[PDB]
Write a protein that binds this DNA or RNA. Sequence first.
RNA 1: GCGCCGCUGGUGUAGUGGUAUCAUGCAAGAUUCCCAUUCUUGCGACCCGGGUUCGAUUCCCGGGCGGCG
RNA 2: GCGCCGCUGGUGUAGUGGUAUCAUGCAAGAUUCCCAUUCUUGCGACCCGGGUUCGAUUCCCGGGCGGCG
Lengths: 458, 458
Amino acid sequence: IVDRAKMEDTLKRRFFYDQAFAIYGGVSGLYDFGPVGCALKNNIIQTWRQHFIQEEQILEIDCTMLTPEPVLKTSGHVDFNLMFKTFIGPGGNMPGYLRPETAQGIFLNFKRLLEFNQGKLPFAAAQIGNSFRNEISPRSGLIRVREFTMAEIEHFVDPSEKDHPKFQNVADLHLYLYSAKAQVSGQSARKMRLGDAVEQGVINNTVLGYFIGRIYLYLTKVGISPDKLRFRQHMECDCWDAESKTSYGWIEIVGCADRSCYDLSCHARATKVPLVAEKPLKEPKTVRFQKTLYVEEVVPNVIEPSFGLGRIMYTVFEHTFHVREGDEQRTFFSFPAVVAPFKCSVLPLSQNQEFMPFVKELSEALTRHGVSHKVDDSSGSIGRRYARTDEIGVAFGVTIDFDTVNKTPHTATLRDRDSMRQIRAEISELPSIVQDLANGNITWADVEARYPLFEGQE
Amino acid sequence: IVDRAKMEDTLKRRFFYDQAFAIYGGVSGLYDFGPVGCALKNNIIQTWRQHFIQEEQILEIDCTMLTPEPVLKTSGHVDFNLMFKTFIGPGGNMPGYLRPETAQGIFLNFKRLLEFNQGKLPFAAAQIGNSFRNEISPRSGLIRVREFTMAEIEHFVDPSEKDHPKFQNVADLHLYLYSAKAQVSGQSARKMRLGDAVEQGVINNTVLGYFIGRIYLYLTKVGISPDKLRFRQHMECDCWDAESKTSYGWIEIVGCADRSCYDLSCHARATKVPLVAEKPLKEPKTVRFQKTLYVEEVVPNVIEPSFGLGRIMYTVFEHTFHVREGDEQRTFFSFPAVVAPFKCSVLPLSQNQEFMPFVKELSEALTRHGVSHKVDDSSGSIGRRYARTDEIGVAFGVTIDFDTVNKTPHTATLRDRDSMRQIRAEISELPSIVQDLANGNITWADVEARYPLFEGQE
RNA sequence: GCGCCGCUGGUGUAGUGGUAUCAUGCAAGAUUCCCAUUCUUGCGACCCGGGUUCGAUUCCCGGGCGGCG
RNA sequence: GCGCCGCUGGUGUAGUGGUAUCAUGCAAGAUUCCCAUUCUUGCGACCCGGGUUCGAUUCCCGGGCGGCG
Ligand SMILES: Nc1ncnc2c1ncn2[C@@H]1O[C@H](COP(=O)(O)O)[C@@H](O)[C@H]1O
Ligand SMILES: Nc1ncnc2c1ncn2[C@@H]1O[C@H](COP(=O)(O)O)[C@@H](O)[C@H]1O
């Protein structure tokens, strides 16, 4: 786990990721994600989407990566430059950049987003996408690259109605908070309950509180260990950072920054286009002339949690990376079964032909159930292929053995990657089992309780 | 349907997509996809992934969008330029471009891809991602833009073993083929069966045949009508194009081009790095000196189906776009229930408070079942809100009515967007129903057969 | 690209050297209890920059964007 | 960025002005019938360009990339 060299090796060898254009020499700070890396990235993203977007009914959008210079001048990003400069169309009349963040488009599409939500508040938009920084010296691999996938969430809330109705769901949750006070006081982080936290005013409100809870739950869900995960409040526009402890030290992997008055303002000035919600009045005010007002203009506070996926990924790598006891050439990852690149591996004992039927029958069966599987029927022994599949963090292994070919209820075995423990179950309900473990409704323990274990080949 | 102005209007108004940076004046050929557009895009992509990637067990990868000039010189793309030019890092020693296609990275990562598949053939890689063209005059909206999402598939096959074992699944399929012969002969396309097609040699092989079948099935699955969908063979490196008929005419939406000798070669020359598979020999040849050879080097043929998602999207728009009979202000889309941005809309009759419970209870219930839903509890009448939800192509509508508040088995109604037909079913199994219709296991007809219809409010 | 006009609430429009008509839409209220009901009330716009003018959204010049070869 | 070395099959390495050692890995065969078994056989490499040389992967110069401030 602590050994970054072994890990880096296992990552490179099995093509989790790799230096970009390595046949042309490679280019620093640019990385390509192979089959397993891509699969893990995708799984992580799907989980994120159905964690925040579905649960909060967030308006997600696709925006363009190119950006006209005036847009990035209004936001003060422009101000030898760390952005990627190009030109648009025919000639150099219209210079643009590659977006440094996927936040801007949301703001620039605010009016239509607000209309879509019927003009009502609060409302959340979000953008999952690639952003680009012309860093000078990228090191640490994924930690500092020049192009990367981030998932951003914009929460637009009435400055006067900033109080979240789903907060008692995250109320009893215990986190490591690293407040600015504790930082200037030469102290360390503290394990507080969330509600206690907001009461004592360490966390401004229950919206930031709720977000912090959910963000926690997500980051732990994908495989980050709580003990090495904290929330450091920014110190001298109130920002909180979800940070993880790695071999490189404490790195920022999520940025929760909540800034009221704005760039929404900025753009509204530069373009002279009001970007403002409106709230009807319970009691219409009359104000020269008699002039009753029935609505008030509202520029909404904005909470912005932005997730850096390269770093969430890497953190998962370091925390999950384990080495077996005995054969230390055998390494594996401990990916949670909901993000594992492959939930299942389909393996026969030896190259014996009578195994070919059941292998295919179930491989076509797992697909029908939508399970990501890797069927390994190559030359080497069962132990070797296990080492291979464990190495890429395959969650479970289905072994077809001689007792599969000679039994009335045809049974195969199911091996837990982590524990090296096995059970034996009929081949007809194996896809059901695997599928459900991959969708987190049950863990390995309950499978171990529901089915008879593997004691030996009869 | 034929009316592009009405459609364009409904697209703009409900924010399916919109001109990029419109508050800054907008920029031609760049478009941002709102909530519904993004949802449809995502659904389409998920369906694509579980259509090709899962079923063929394709090695999917994430590659970088930036690209060093030598890479694109080897591929002869460079040769006032239609690509987006920038520089990498500190200064202008290292100029690069924005990838015009997501194909290159796959080739550049070929060796590790081939190793991952144990060196065996055949094997498929694929890349879903954005590509960039500095077009001069973009028109037709999505048809010709400057940045767009394409999904590419690389199939690597032994030139001598080009014969697909899953072809009898697409054998009895009937398509419109537009062969080059028919084109130079002043004829039109022909509705051939696929197997007949390959026998008479109009389609070179059963791999191109199989791909063509699957591509067909996919494009029809997402909502493209067969009658306005054909496969035109390229005429004077054998290429086939999946084309659709729109108001703009026949446009190319998928490119199936199958070119043996290569850019794999090109890169292998420029970099001096052999990109070649190897095949063991059944009978080891002995060839001066006695020198037995046991493997032959094989440069594999490559089949490349590339999908243009902007165009597949637009095609879906034009084909699905319908206008009601009577109130022609009422327009709707006929999105297949597997790609519909929202499968369900949750609607009460009137603003009456006693409806608030059941609405929430099921909205939290649909989420638990993972169903994308839009709960509309706004001021206007049921007809207005229907018009709204139909307008964005919501697949089904759940109506909470007075008979929901006063019945022992609490029942609500389910309305079919297309037909305007309704049924009535208990609120406890509604998420099940909706969920399954959204996962294509049953159609509306079987629901209409399984449940009692809506005849009137008791 | 090059060309002939054009750009007014979210959408569709009338109008003029003295800051804007009507319809739809969206909210709130009341009606209404199945398919944009009705009434009331409220919300929102002259694509940018420069020039000419006492004053331009209107006239002229140049961005940008759109329709079409 | 600037700096001190460095780059040899997929990975880890020995070696030298005359084109490369060993281990692992991956295939095929045979053993083996639960956790990288064993034997046999096969597959694969000197990061690029220039210079000096009869000849460089080795020496020098400059790309690129990596480790580290
Ligand atoms: N050079 C970079 N490489 C990887 N991630 C980055 C980089 N810069 C910013 N991020 C991500 O940005 C998030 C914080 O937002 P910000 O620091 O404002 O960009 C973190 O989650 C990071 O993962
Ligand atoms: N300017 C463009 N806009 C949208 N799609 C494009 C464009 N150029 C190529 N494509 C897509 O590329 C595919 C065919 O490949 P190719 O024409 O070689 O790029 C089609 O499916 C198109 O959708």
